[PDB]
């Protein structure tokens, strides 16, 4: 009867500790003891990490509001040290269920090697990589229980900082319309070999192409050779993960020159690719012919 | 459930090492009072610093109607090499590339999308310049907020550099040493960059449509052919060859061409051969 008494008081002080957690009132009523322990331990670890920073304002809350992705800091062992609340908006899983667990239990298997090489033309500590994370979201909300969770491609960018942490902002690649359209972008559709099957009419204003002439042509013929490798890698990602974001690259205009571009590509359903290209520049070197088609059109 | 009791042991030991100031429930008691020694998981200030540790960016707030800068954070100085002197008192259009003004104005329009609506765009902004301004690509994400005339709408945004990998000649800072070309499998020039003009004396259009063999010394032509056939039978691995190239003027030049086939990432068909042609 003394063993019980002690265990009952253990559960009581553990529930009191759950009441000390930095969450709204009543949330602790939905937690189990293991989750209480995990969240308290991770809270103390994150406080130790934030205390090591060498530095109250009402404009602070703007920062997470201005971001589109979510905050994630991972330890050197791969455990999710911290996630911001808006993670629920991107993966369905909340920070309550994810803080204190290992990232590898929520990453696609074939991405674990990439992440492991990230946790150990680019500044030495800066990190850019795509990661498939478990998400329970559909267009109707959080409708998937964890075992039918789908893979969501996240463009992760951040820094190795110093224990050593990897601090990332992780952003979702939106899935791709009707006039009137905006400026600084156009849309294209390709087969999996990246041959044009459709292209926005705005291309005529952007690069001077009529969309009908692009139909059937390989997209790789329209990139600057200097951007060869990078675009290749992007497409490889697009082919293995389902979505990708390219770097800045030069797209060749019809009669000469090029313009700076960055595109988001998504595989859709037998399968095809949709590209949303955001323009960075207007046509540069307009009087310079670079490709054979460019000099065939300059005449 | 033997696992369940054993993870709870480990946890109590982790919290043991976490609380600075025993038996498990004594651990829990002192951890309760320690937690009460210190509602969100992190403070807004902490999260701000975390975000600034992740992104190379700065927060700005500008009026939607005129672009007038109403706030910029001090991290604009390390990011853009720009004093806050340059932003406060100006408009965002003063900072961006002229070619971006229209786009900016459209992003700042709240006609169809207003309070709480999101914005995401790319522009080029002025950085610190010693002697003609120099622009850098900035990715901006933010939201529309009524700013307390009446309460005018404002864009509250973060602008970041280096969201992806950055996108040449690097051994001679003055005159180009090489140029890149592309060829069909037949060897015809289908792409050349303008450095050709400085390296071999030809305008790009003087090479496009012609075969690379047409510029190779006859005594070296068979060697060049062999090397190209070999690179076609390899799949992406680079192979080098050295041969005498005929200049538009100024005689024969020793030239190192290192080539590899571009494989379609899906169909694995040859898109073209890529060549780096370097004057030896």
Numbering used by the authors:
A (entry chain B): 19 to 73, 80 to 144, 154 to 195, 214 to 227, 230 to 322, 329 to 358
B (entry chain A): 98 to 118, 126 to 142, 156 to 229, 255 to 273, 300 to 316, 331 to 349, 352 to 464
Excerpt from the paper describing this PDB structure:
Hypoxia-inducible factors (HIFs) are α/β heterodimeric transcription factors modulating cellular responses to the low oxygen condition. There are three HIF-α isoforms in mammals (HIF-1α, HIF-2α, and HIF-3α), each encoded by a different gene. Through crystallographic analysis of HIF-3 α/β heterodimer in both apo and OEA-bound forms, hydrogen-deuterium exchange mass spectrometry (HDX-MS), molecular dynamics (MD) simulations, and biochemical and cell-based assays, we unveil the molecular mechanism of OEA entry and binding to the PAS-B pocket of HIF-3α, and show that it leads to enhanced heterodimer stability and functional modulation of HIF-3.
Interestingly, the potential role of HIF-3α as a lipid sensor was suggested mainly based on the crystal structure of its PAS-B domain in complex with bacterial lipids, which remained bound within the cavity during protein expression, purification and crystallization. Here, we began by examining the overall heterodimeric structure of HIF-3α-ARNT complex, consisting of the N-terminal segments (including the bHLH, PAS-A and PAS-B domains as shown in Fig. 1a) from both proteins. To fully visualize the ligand-binding potential of HIF-3α, we crystallized the multi-domain mouse HIF-3α-ARNT complex and solved its structure at 2.3 Å resolution. Each asymmetric unit of the crystal contained a single heterodimer. However, it remains unclear if this distinction is real or artificial, as it may have risen only due to the differences in their respective crystal packings that impact this region. The contrasting finding about the pocket contents of overexpressed HIF-3α proteins suggests that although bacteria-derived lipids can bind to HIF-3α, their ease of removal during purification is consistent with their reversible binding capability. As calculated by Fpocket program, we didn’t find a sizeable pocket in the HIF-3α PAS-A domain, but observed an empty cavity of about 280 Å3 within the PAS-B domain, comparable in size to the corresponding HIF-2α pocket. This vacancy provided us with a clear opportunity to screen small-molecule libraries to identify unique molecules capable of binding to HIF-3α selectively.
